[PDB]
Point group: C4
Chain length 199, copies 4
């Protein structure tokens, strides 16, 4: 409950910033919405608290909390639990609101994403609507190829996501090369399903 | 209003430091002036507050706040909004007082500047007074050439500025090479207007 | 005694996190146990406090506190006190609970360990039980060879340990090459005692 | 005066640490002495406070505070004021007590020192007593040659010092190569005065 306190003072700081910068009504709305969904009335130093513990405990926990994510994700579900653990360790949580552009075709990409809860759409130059849902991932292709985002990804609903930064994606994939081919294979299918080809 | 509180305690800390170091009257004046102009009676953790939000929101906002800057700047105004966004993300705000030397001819340079509000003068070995004003930029040439500051830049008024550090200038220019030629071209004109030439 | 205060509020933060994440009874138990053993009712900013001091003092102290460790460790005990000092400077303290897997055969390794108090067991594919105790070290082999953990290490009791990260192991071993051969030699004996061979 | 408060609570934290670690009487004495001399009853966040200001102001100030240091130091006194400014920017303050070993012959070196107030002695294998005093510097030779400390430096009195870390020494010397030869020359004389020779 110290945290249901922090929450309301932080959102008081937020409101101030908005005032000083004179942001428009529907933009203050947008930001207020996101806050509720992002923090849901509570704020605490997740990271700090895990830092006080050792690895074994840190790994039991992350494994427990991400239990449904691992289980509904063919790639994780069917993998070396240790790879899973490595991966889960480096995920950072994120929230997107409906109509947000998580990824823009063209852009340079430094992150990939795991869908916890939500629906998201894959768009190219008239590739129709391709939907990804819980236990799906996107944003891998860019990272592998070191070239540019091969399509745009828009949030169709509120999207609860876990993201993995490029350095982290590569550190882990250094340790588990077998798991690179796993990514690569689904990526060639994805590029094959839309009609693209890459070096 | 928590921030109109912080302000006055921070400037109380400042006054103490000055006392312990026995700084002269007109130097304490100079520092007091700058404080008022730099913070204008208020202090808050801009960065912190943007960190709690996601990218879409962070980008809407920075775009809104820098609206006049983008619009009065041929280079930004006539560019890929995404390049603009990339750029705006990495700008840090700065204040200079009249007669300050923002850049010294000769020096190694690690920053460039965008004039928000103010007037500034370009000086070389008898190149007269060349003035840059709102929606102008300077300090690019050094960064491009990786050699030394090609002229001095003095603040003729109070100058409100946004600066961009070298690593950031290059990260963005990696992503938008077309925009490098834009810089390069105005730079050759600038060196041509004063009579200099560089590898 | 400010620290016997901090302790109880921090463990209050811990309890909250557990609640919000709905961790199971024996896992909250496990975490509560570790806390007592790890901090033993008290928390203070060891690092912070050493940072205020200079090197000479920082070195006297670390030498004093690690007095029994150095003295019961053939490798340290019989070495250049300065090497010892360098080493001791970079050790970070850690606690493991009985049945924890400190190191997993196969894994990539970024740390090595010094046993202060406790017993630990070395396991391979039917290599029986090999026990290491106070003033022993393990996890060196991986670091030297830059290849993978050559066996698993499990905590048989509560284990009080000091660990040394790879960068630190190498920085020091750059300065004291003679001391590399010391490590290398015991490592070849260790690999010889279990029947393994490495490039 | 907020700072004459902080001081006494910090030294209360220090006392606690000592108790928990059961340090000997003359070692608690040694640490208490140093505290008085190092902070002299007051503590404040020098760095923090300079961070709020811009460069021009930051440079005026550091120049003012180090006025006697620059003026009694042939190397600084007779140099490009800008080089001086660059240098002064990166100095960190340090205190040593009588009989401390600031530098040990043999060791790898990552710092050099400027004597503000104090006396210090240069020792080799029977090179007698060579004393350096206010406006002198030492620890340069190592940094230049990238090899090892060429002699030991002991504090003969309480020594008030400013130190410059290797990266910083090189960054500045990149910008002012002329000033490298200045260092190099005095270094060859120093090695010539004791009878040593180096690649
Ligand atoms: N056929 C597909 N089905 C689902 N998702 C896709 C498909 N093709 C591309 N994507 C995703 O859209 C992402 C756009 O960014 P990336 O190129 O980094 O990675 C791309 C894929 O992860
Ligand atoms: N002809 C010009 N008109 C306006 N500004 C200039 C001109 N020439 C040089 N400058 C600016 O002065 C700056 C001095 O530092 P730089 O060499 O980094 O970059 C230089 C330019 O940005
Ligand atoms: N014969 C042995 N006796 C004791 N410890 C060992 C022996 N062989 C290996 N180990 C330790 O087990 C560790 C497993 O990880 P490393 O390969 O990094 O380093 C290994 C050694 O430090
Ligand atoms: N002849 C000398 N007179 C004064 N100081 C010296 C002399 N020779 C060496 N020193 C200092 O002692 C220092 C020992 O460490 P360094 O080799 O890094 O740098 C050395 C010099 O800065």
């Amino acid at each position: 409950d110290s945290s249901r306190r922090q929450y309301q003072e932080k959102y008081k700081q937020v409101e101030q910033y908005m005032s000083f910068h004179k942001l428009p009504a529907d933009m203050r709305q947008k930001i207020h919405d996101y806050y509720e969904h992002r923090y849901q009335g509570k704020i605490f130093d997740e990271e700090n608290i895990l830092s006080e513990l050792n690895d074994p405990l840190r790994e039991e926990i992350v494994n427990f909390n991400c239990r449904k994510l691992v289980a509904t994700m063919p790639l994780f579900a069917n993998a070396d639990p240790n790879f899973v653990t490595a991966m889960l360790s480096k995920l950072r949580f994120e929230v997107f609101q409906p109509g947000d552009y998580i990824i823009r075709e063209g852009a340079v990409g430094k992150k990939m994403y795991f869908i916890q809860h939500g629906v998201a759409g894959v768009i190219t130059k008239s590739s129709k609507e391709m939907k990804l849902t819980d236990g799906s991932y996107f944003g891998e292709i860019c990272l592998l190829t070191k070239g540019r985002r091969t399509a745009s990804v828009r949030a169709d609903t509120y999207c609860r996501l876990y993201s993995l930064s490029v350095d982290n994606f590569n550190e882990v994939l250094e340790e588990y090369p077998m798991m690179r081919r796993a990514f690569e294979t689904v990526a060639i299918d994805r590029l094959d399903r839309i009609g693209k080809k890459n070096s």
